[PDB]
Design an enzyme around this catalytic site. Structure first.
Site, PDB file in Angstrom:
ATOM      1  N   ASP A  90      45.515  93.603   2.395  1.00  0.00           N
ATOM      2  CA  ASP A  90      44.728  92.483   1.780  1.00  0.00           C
ATOM      3  C   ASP A  90      44.807  92.431   0.133  1.00  0.00           C
ATOM      4  OD1 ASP A  90      43.630  91.857   4.293  1.00  0.00           O
ATOM      5  OD2 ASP A  90      42.023  93.447   3.918  1.00  0.00           O
ATOM      6  N   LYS A 106      27.975  88.820  -5.221  1.00  0.00           N
ATOM      7  CA  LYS A 106      29.091  88.633  -4.424  1.00  0.00           C
ATOM      8  C   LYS A 106      29.408  87.326  -4.196  1.00  0.00           C
ATOM      9  CE  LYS A 106      31.706  90.262  -0.411  1.00  0.00           C
ATOM     10  NZ  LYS A 106      31.894  91.256   0.900  1.00  0.00           N
ATOM     11  N   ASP A 139      46.364  85.377   2.661  1.00  0.00           N
ATOM     12  CA  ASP A 139      46.530  86.269   1.460  1.00  0.00           C
ATOM     13  C   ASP A 139      46.538  87.767   2.266  1.00  0.00           C
ATOM     14  OD1 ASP A 139      43.798  87.284   0.999  1.00  0.00           O
ATOM     15  OD2 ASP A 139      43.299  85.233   0.758  1.00  0.00           O
TER      16      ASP A 139
END
Lengths: 1066, 176, 326
Positions: A758, A827, A987
């Site tokens: 990732d 976050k 991604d």
DNA sequence: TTAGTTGGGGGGTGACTGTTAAAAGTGCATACCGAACAAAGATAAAATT
DNA sequence: AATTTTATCTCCAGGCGGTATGCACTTTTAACAGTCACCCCCCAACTAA
């Protein structure tokens, strides 16, 4: 009574004589009536010249004399005229044309295209009188003959096999008129047979006439793609593991499945004991289905009869569109749609749209079958499969698209989509017929106790605020009967099931993906067409990179994991497990003061039923594909990101869907494969996120007992894996690791398991690369280091430092929360910064977590949200300043461009052109009808004003999304040359456990190469040239140029260090 | 009936006044003349009539239209609603009977084969206050007529099989 | 655009009307937005125990100062009647309250439906929110929730001309007839007590008095009769079929019937229930070709009762919880 | 379930043959009307006076 | 120019329905007058769609 009979016979005879006299002076008109008196005299004279009136000379004279947005009615008439050709009903179209040309008011709608269509239709049969009539029409209307008119005349002359003098006169007339014969053979409307016949007619008098010579297609010469298409080098393209015969058999099976257009699978629900009630319900269901089929057939016949008469009276109708397909096919499609309806109903507009999208696909497939492209496709595919087969040798290794072109590409029979009003009208008509023609008994328990019949589908209104929405809802008795019968099969549309053979290569924006069914290259709304126009207007060699990457992504061969599927089924059928991701059965449920409990309990059981039905389709497909190999084609959205076409079962779902998939072709683990497998397992667990790879491997080695126990007894052992972030993928990784370790040679075991890599906040990585800011780059792992760097932790630490400083200074709300600042709080905001978040949207995100916080006082939430949002944004300003400059510049440019009255567009570094389809819908479109007035939006109305609010909001993120798609495309293209299996999720990049080192190296190399080029300056120059270069307006252009030409300056960062970064991709 | 007292008839147009004054004079002048060429010669004279006569006829027509408009405006108040309902049902029935008449004429204008005759009907045709005599022959009933009545329809049967042939060609598919 | 009463004679007449007959003297009077307080002091001088639910924070000091030595009853709570019982938000801010907490503070007790009126509420409706307030009160009444759980509470308020004309529409005035008229005439006995122009009340802004003549001329330009309406819940509203746990189907039926105003009730019945529509129409005593706007408010209740009362078919209605939030 | 011949005497409406003009219908377009559920403080862009 | 008003995080295929009014253009029927041509209302009867 002989005298009476004689008198009656005499009266009948004079009556039929009178009828004959009144007829010889409801037929269909063939001779037009012309406004011009001298033209009417000319037509009368041409008719009166001789009983065998030669029309060829008059046609030659008529041709040789040669003296912005269509309306809804015009579009519908043009579609009618075009469809009358495929339907093979020419007199109807001709009569409609003559009637429209007759009346003064109606003749103003007609355009040269309709005349050309009818002329070509008449010419295809080798007719001359009707062609002369339409020539009279086009001359009287004041228009001019064009390329298509001359093509029709030449085709008619060639078909009728006339003498060369008239052909010589016609051709020389085109020569004097400035018409090019070679330009004639490029007309899209003409088919292969028409061009062949025109060529024969030309060759009759010009035998030395030849088509332009063929040339090999050019290769891409772009700076970035020059390495991919370089002919000097070593290439080892991967091959499949199957022989040729098996692949050909699979191709035949897939072709049969697509021609059938339906695939049935066995349901995976718990089988039911065949009680008496089940059999009785099944008998009732079968009888009802047969009755509905017969009634629907009768209704369709009556509707066609009714619709023909409207055209017979000079009005536009939908008769040919109903005549396109067979009656049985339409009835079967309607029955399938009725069966697939949910219990809660469906919107009327959505049903109307869906019922017209399925009609087009069947029409296209049947057209392909009848015309004769199926045999050519079979031959070409069976010849081209030699490239991918293991036991076959192609003379020269090529990319799939290059080989498919080199073999000689058959021409694609492009099919014209219908206009939006026609689609909506057809869908509404079909839905109304289905609603009207279906009936069921009122009392199912005892027939004839109450003999009255009641409808199956009801039309109720649903209210939301003020607005009404028309909704079709099934009768509850039918729903209960369906639930009681417990049918054992499901039906899937042929486009919703993964292909069983390797997909067709993408060779053009028209052809690719499924064998016969249509598929958009750029998925978007039904009417939008600007993306396709931009794609087609570009040079042919620009889109080669995108097409090649899509083809490479679509050629990965998958297969279904067995043991994981068995365990998931065991959990699913018995009781479920909501803590794991398996929905619970409807049997297990919680089940004016009593109103509150009933209101909440009914609320709970809705989404519980929604999830169970959603996962029933996915798990039934996997069981059906449990001993087979399947493929998933791909396409793009309007920015460039790639998605698979089959929606039900693909690797873009939850962990239950990602745990059932594995590569069909395995590779030996090599000398550095076991370590990567263990590291992937630890990554899946999520316990050691902020630790180096050495510590992850050490931790993996220290808990080998738990891994082995979970691989041995998953559901009756220690059950350690259930504590992971992804419980299901972790089980599969445990099984693979245990199998690899137990083997005699751990370096030779073959592994079929993907390994992910990732990227942490890829949007911010691209932003930092563009801005070249050292401080921002160092925090998203763009610099070498020994441990991973987390941006969320850094932001939280800075916010906590600010809070401590404020509390030391003195403030009530600051000292209220101490130790309550963590990564979880900020976050979401830090993640959403890329999508243009603000100080208002962050408040609602921070408050959501603060409410769940327990020890925090509930009387300080508002002040705490304000303070936290302000502090987070202030800290974000320090870390990323180039990002803020870039965002402001892009937003201002988009706003200024939209104020001028134009939608933004740009070009990705690969070469794909992009455009933003945001427009304001002011005028409303409706369709009056028997049941309801459906309101739709006319997509494809290029006259609407741009939506400035939605174009300054969606520009900055779409640029970054296009950039990351380009990076993925380059990585896939360069990985293919080394012989790797590559599959990507936006991604996240997947590959075998033995090629991770190579994939990481290629990722870093391609990222550096992509971002070394001057992207921002190229974008600014394109924007300046495309929009600002206008002499008509000077002040708006001056402001736009002033804004665009000021590109933010780069920082001081070196991009070469990415090639030495361990945790850039982790 | 009720419509006449409720409201008078519409005023006659200019060309109608011209027909009223001149055509009877033209008809009186020519004794053997019939209305076809009489009305066509009247049209020719009107086309040849000077515009002054057209203007004066139009002035008379508009004066009559104005007085009729005032009369109607006064009349709409002098009719009780019961007369309004009677008028409405009268026009509705008139429209229905006119539609039935034109449909029957349409059906008969295509040479429809005759319906099968009756044995008593054939007998009374051969044997021949008409109502009194019809009642007399009907109560009396209570040349191979029985077979000929069906034989004629079977003779007409070949016609109706042929009678469907032209309709599909002509385009009237509703009849069959 | 809040309003308040400043005239002495208007306040005296309003107090005389509010007290009315001396029947049941110790009637508690909840005052909605007393404002300056001349009405409250007039009612106190009339001899009634009044508690004021004032919203603005700057008005309690004057009320308490005038009532410091009142020696009667001038209990004051910083609450808003129309903001009572919010449906979202974990905690309730001081401007809002709870329908149970306020009554706990007032010391009054719950009483069944059949008994008498326990309390009276007076005030004026929001300037721009007549429909919102009416719908909220209807939803709080038909379910016997919020303030109505404590008995039949009488509400006397002022209203504008347009909203009043819509509210009292009848089948003899089908231009303005709608659902709200039906659902408010089916439960209450609407009365008209007083009439007053807009010039009698002195408008107020966020800053303060709106003394500008030009904006006062706008009040002359926007001069509408401000009717006074009294609402008392009907005793026989809740029958064995129109239970508080069943009104949702009734509301949806009324909403659907007014979706197509110019249509007969037979087609709506065919599109709403599977039962024989003609049977229902015969049972309620009407013909087949009956328009929707020709039905009196009690006829809708009769039709709903007739449909719900049957027992032959298991399924009677097509309304489900899925037809919400669509 | 309703209509056509059959049957003559008696009414009825229109055709044939003209021109005119005031309604009646068509196809498109815009405008206004329809359920709730708090809100505190902030800020820059868009709309209006 | 200043004052008051409005929206506030992207992509993966979404859109309210009914009633009233206005306008530009085409189609339809009623009005007159003489003949005459066939159809249609009656008592009663039978057969087909």
């Amino acid at each position: 009574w002989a005298k009476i009979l004689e008198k009656d016979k005499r009266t009948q005879q004079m009556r039929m004589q009178r009828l004959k006299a009144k007829l010889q002076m409801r037929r269909l008109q063939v001779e037009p009536r012309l406004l011009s008196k001298q033209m009417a005299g000319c037509l009368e004279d041409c008719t009166r010249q001789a009983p065998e009136s030669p029309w060829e000379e008059q046609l030659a004279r008529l041709l040789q004399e040669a003296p912005a947005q269509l309306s809804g009615q015009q579009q519908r008439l043009l579609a009618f005229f075009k469809c009358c050709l495929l339907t093979d009903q020419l007199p109807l179209a001709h009569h409609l044309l003559v009637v429209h040309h007759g009346q003064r008011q109606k003749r103003k709608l007609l355009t040269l295209d309709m005349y050309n269509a009818v002329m070509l239709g008449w010419a295809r049969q080798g007719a001359f009188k009707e062609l002369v009539y339409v020539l009279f029409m086009v001359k009287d209307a004041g228009l001019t003959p064009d390329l298509l008119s001359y093509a029709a005349a030449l085709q008619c002359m060639g078909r009728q096999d006339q003498d060369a003098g008239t052909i010589e006169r016609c051709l020389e007339q085109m020569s004097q008129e400035g018409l090019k014969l070679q330009a004639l053979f490029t007309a899209v409307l003409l088919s292969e047979e028409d061009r062949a016949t025109v060529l024969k007619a030309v060759h009759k008098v010009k035998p030395t006439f030849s088509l332009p010579p063929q040339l090999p297609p050019p290769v891409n010469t772009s700076k970035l793609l020059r390495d991919v298409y370089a002919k000097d080098g070593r290439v080892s393209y991967p091959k499949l593991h199957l022989p040729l015969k098996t692949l050909q058999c699979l191709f035949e099976k897939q072709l049969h499945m697509e021609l059938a257009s339906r695939v049935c699978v066995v349901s995976v629900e718990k089988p039911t004991l065949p009680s008496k009630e089940v059999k009785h319900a099944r008998k009732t269901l079968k009888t009802l289905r047969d009755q509905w089929e017969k009634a629907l057939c009768r209704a369709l016949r009556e509707t066609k009869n009714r619709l023909e008469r409207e055209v017979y009276e000079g009005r536009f109708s939908l008769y040919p569109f109903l005549c396109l397909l067979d009656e049985r096919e339409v009835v079967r499609m309607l029955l399938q749609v009725l069966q697939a309806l949910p219990a809660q109903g469906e919107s009327f507009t959505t049903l109307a749209r869906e019922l017209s999208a399925r009609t087009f696909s069947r029409h296209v497939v049947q057209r392909q079958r009848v015309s004769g492209q199926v045999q050519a496709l079979q031959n070409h595919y069976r010849k081209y499969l030699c490239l991918l087969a293991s036991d076959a040798e192609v003379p020269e290794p090529c990319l799939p698209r290059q080989y498919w072109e080199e073999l000689g590409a058959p021409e694609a029979l492009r099919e014209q989509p219908w206009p939006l009003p026609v689609q909506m009208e057809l869908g509404k008509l079909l839905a109304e017929m289905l609603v009207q023609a279906t009936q069921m008994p009122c009392s199912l328990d005892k027939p004839h106790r109450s003999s009255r019949l009641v409808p199956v589908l009801y039309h109720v209104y649903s209210f939301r605020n003020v607005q009404q929405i028309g909704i079709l809802k099934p009768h509850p008795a039918y729903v209960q009967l369906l639930e009681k019968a417990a049918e054992p099969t499901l039906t899937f549309e042929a486009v919703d099931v993964p292909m069983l053979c390797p997909p067709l290569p993408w060779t053009s924006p028209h052809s690719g993906a499924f064998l016969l069914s249509p598929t958009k290259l750029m998925r978007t709304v039904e009417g939008a067409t600007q993306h396709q126009e931009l794609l087609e207007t570009c040079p042919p060699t620009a889109l080669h990179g995108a097409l090649d990457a899509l083809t490479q992504l679509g050629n990965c061969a998958w297969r279904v994991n067995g043991r994981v599927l068995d365990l998931v089924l065991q959990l699913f059928q018995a009781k479920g497990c909501p803590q794991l991701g398996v929905p619970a059965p409807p049997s297990e449920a919680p089940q004016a003061e009593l109103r509150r409990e009933l209101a909440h309990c009914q609320k709970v059981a809705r989404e519980m039923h929604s999830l169970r039905a959603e996962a029933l389709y996915r798990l039934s497909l996997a069981q059906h594909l449990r001993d087979r190999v399947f493929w998933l084609p791909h396409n793009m959205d309007f920015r460039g990101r790639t998605y698979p076409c089959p929606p039900h079962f693909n690797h873009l779902g939850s962990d239950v869907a990602r745990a059932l998939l594995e590569f069909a072709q395995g590779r030996p683990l090599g000398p550095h494969g076991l370590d990567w497998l263990k590291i992937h397992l630890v990554n899946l667990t999520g316990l050691k996120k902020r630790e180096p790879l050495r510590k992850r491997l050490a931790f993996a080695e220290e808990v080998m007992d738990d891994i082995l126990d979970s691989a041995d007894q998953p559901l009756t052992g220690r059950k350690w894996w259930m504590g992971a972030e992804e419980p299901w993928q972790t089980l599969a990784c445990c099984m693979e690791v245990a199998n690899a370790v137990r083997a005699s040679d751990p370096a030779a075991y073959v592994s079929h398991l993907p390994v992910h890599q990732d990227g942490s906040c890829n949007g911010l990585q691209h932003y930092a690369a563009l801005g070249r800011d050292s401080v921002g780059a160092a925090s998203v792992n763009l610099e070498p280091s020994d441990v991973p760097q987390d941006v969320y932790s850094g932001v939280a630490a800075q916010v906590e430092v600010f809070r401590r400083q404020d509390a030391q200074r003195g403030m009530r709300v600051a000292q209220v929360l101490e130790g309550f600042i963590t990564r979880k709080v900020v976050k979401q905001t830090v993640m959403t910064v890329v999508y243009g978040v603000t100080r208002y949207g962050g408040r609602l995100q921070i408050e959501k977590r603060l409410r769940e916080l327990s020890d925090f006082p509930q009387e300080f939430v508002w002040e705490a949200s304000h303070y936290l949002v302000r502090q987070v944004f202030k800290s974000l300003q320090e870390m990323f300043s180039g990002t803020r400059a870039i965002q402001h510049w892009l937003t201002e440019s988009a706003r200024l461009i939209s104020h001028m009255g134009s939608v933004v567009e740009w070009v990705t570094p690969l070469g794909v052109p992009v455009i933003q389809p945001y427009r304001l819908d002011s005028k409303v479109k409706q369709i009056g009808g028997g049941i309801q007035s459906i309101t739709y939006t006319h997509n494809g109305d290029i006259s609407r004003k741009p939506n400035t609010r939605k174009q300054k909001n969606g520009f900055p993120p779409n640029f970054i999304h296009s950039l990351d798609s380009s990076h993925m495309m380059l990585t896939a293209l360069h990985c293919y040359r080394k012989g790797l299996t590559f599959v990507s999720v936006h991604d996240c990049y997947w590959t075998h456990a033995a090629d991770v080192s190579v994939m990481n190296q290629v990722c870093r190399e391609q990222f550096v190469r992509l971002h070394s080029e001057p992207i921002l300056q190229d974008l600014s120059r394109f924007l300046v040239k495309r929009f600002c270069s206008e002499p008509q307006k000077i002040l708006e252009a001056s402001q736009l140029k002033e804004t665009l030409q000021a590109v933010p300056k780069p920082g001081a960062f070196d991009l070469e260090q990415v090639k030495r970064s361990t945790y850039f991709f982790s | 009936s009720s419509v006449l007292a409720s409201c008078p008839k519409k005023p006659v147009s200019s060309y109608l006044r011209f027909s009223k004054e001149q055509l009877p004079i033209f008809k009186a002048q020519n004794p053997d003349a019939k209305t076809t060429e009489l009305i066509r010669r009247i049209a020719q004279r009107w086309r040849e009539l000077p515009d002054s006569k057209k203007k004066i006829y139009q002035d008379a027509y508009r004066a009559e239209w104005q007085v009729y408009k005032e009369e109607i405006s006064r009349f709409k108040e002098q009719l009780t609603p019961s007369q309004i309902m009677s008028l409405e049902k009268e026009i509705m029935d008139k429209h229905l009977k006119r539609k039935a008449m034109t449909k029957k004429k349409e059906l008969t204008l295509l040479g429809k084969p005759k319906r099968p005759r009756s044995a008593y009907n054939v007998y009374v045709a051969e044997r021949f206050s008409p109502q009194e005599k019809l009642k007399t022959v009907k109560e009396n009933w209570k040349e191979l007529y029985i077979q000929h009545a069906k034989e004629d329809e079977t003779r007409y049967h070949n016609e109706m099989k042929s009678w469907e042939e032209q309709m599909i060609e002509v385009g009237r598919k509703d009849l069959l | 655009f809040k309003r308040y009463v400043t005239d002495r004679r208007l306040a005296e007449t309003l107090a005389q009307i509010y007290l009315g007959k001396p029947s049941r003297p110790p009637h508690l009077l909840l005052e909605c937005n007393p404002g300056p307080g001349i009405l409250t002091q007039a009612l106190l001088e009339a001899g009634a125990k009044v508690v004021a639910l004032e919203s603005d924070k700057t008005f309690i000091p004057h009320l308490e100062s005038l009532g410091k030595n009142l020696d009667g009853k001038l209990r004051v709570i910083h609450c808003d009647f129309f903001k009572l019982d919010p449906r979202s938000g974990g905690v309730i801010k001081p401007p809002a309250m709870s329908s149970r907490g306020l009554f706990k503070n007032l010391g009054i007790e719950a009483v069944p439906w059949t008994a008498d009126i326990p309390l009276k509420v007076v005030g004026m409706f929001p300037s721009r929110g007549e429909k919102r307030a009416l719908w909220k009160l209807a939803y709080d009444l038909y379910s016997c929730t919020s303030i109505y759980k404590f008995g039949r509470i009488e509400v006397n308020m002022f209203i504008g001309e347009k909203e009043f004309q819509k509210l009292m529409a009848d089948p003899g005035n089908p231009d303005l007839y709608h659902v709200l008229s039906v659902i408010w005439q089916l439960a209450c006995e609407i009365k008209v007590l007083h009439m007053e122009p807009w010039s009698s009340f002195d408008i107020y802004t966020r800053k303060g008095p709106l003394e500008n003549p030009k904006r006062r001329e706008l009040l002359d330009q926007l001069q509408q009769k401000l009717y006074l309406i009294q609402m008392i819940p009907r005793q026989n509203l809740f029958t064995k079929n129109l239970t508080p746990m069943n009104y949702n189907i009734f509301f949806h039926l009324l909403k659907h019937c007014f979706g197509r105003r110019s249509a007969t009730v037979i087609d709506h019945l065919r599109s709403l229930t599977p039962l024989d529509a003609r049977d229902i129409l015969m049972q309620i005593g009407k013909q087949e070709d009956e328009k929707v706007v020709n039905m009196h408010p009690q006829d809708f209740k009769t039709l709903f009762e007739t449909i719900e009362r049957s027992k032959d078919c298991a399924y009677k209605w097509l309304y489900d919880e899925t037809l919400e939030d669509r």
